[PDB]
Amino acid sequence: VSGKWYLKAMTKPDSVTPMILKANLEAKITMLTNGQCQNITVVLHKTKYTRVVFIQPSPVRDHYILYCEGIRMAKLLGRDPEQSQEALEDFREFSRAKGLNQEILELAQSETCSPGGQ
Numbered sequence: 001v002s003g004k005w006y007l008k009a010m011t012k013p014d015s016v017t018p019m020i021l022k023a024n025l026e027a028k029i030t031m032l033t034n035g036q037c038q039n040i041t042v043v044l045h046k047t048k049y050t051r052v053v054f055i056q057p058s059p060v061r062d063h064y065i066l067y068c069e070g071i072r073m074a075k076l077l078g079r080d081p082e083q084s085q086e087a088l089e090d091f092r093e094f095s096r097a098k099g100l101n102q103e104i105l106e107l108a109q110s111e112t113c114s115p116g117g118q
């Protein structure tokens with residue numbers, strides 16, 4: 001669960017850069033949001049982690065599913081960028097199976113974020 005990862009879907013972002021999980025666990029995405037850039041860097045510490053976040057394996061080759069409470073959403077991380085309909089279908093069930101049913105948004109993959117006119 002280390003290295004380049006791709007946040008593929010989620011139950012706001014207009015595009016998203018790759019994810020970098022360093023091992024407490026430490027993630028860095030940068031997120032394109034209405035012509036801005038949100039550079040995130042969230043340490044996850046082991047208590048299910050900490051917001052509160054449960055990482056769980058996906059049933060599918062090369063994918064993981066995140067549940068986090070703190071509003072509650074769900075995310076589908078992948079190890080290679082391409083769309084996996086069968087990874088989605090499972091992320092949907094999981095998402096309804098945990099109380100979340102507000103549009104599986106499948107994310108746009110940019111290699112950089114440049115702010116509007118910045």
Ligand SMILES: [Ca+2]
Binds near residue numbers: 013033
């Ligand atoms: Ca938008």
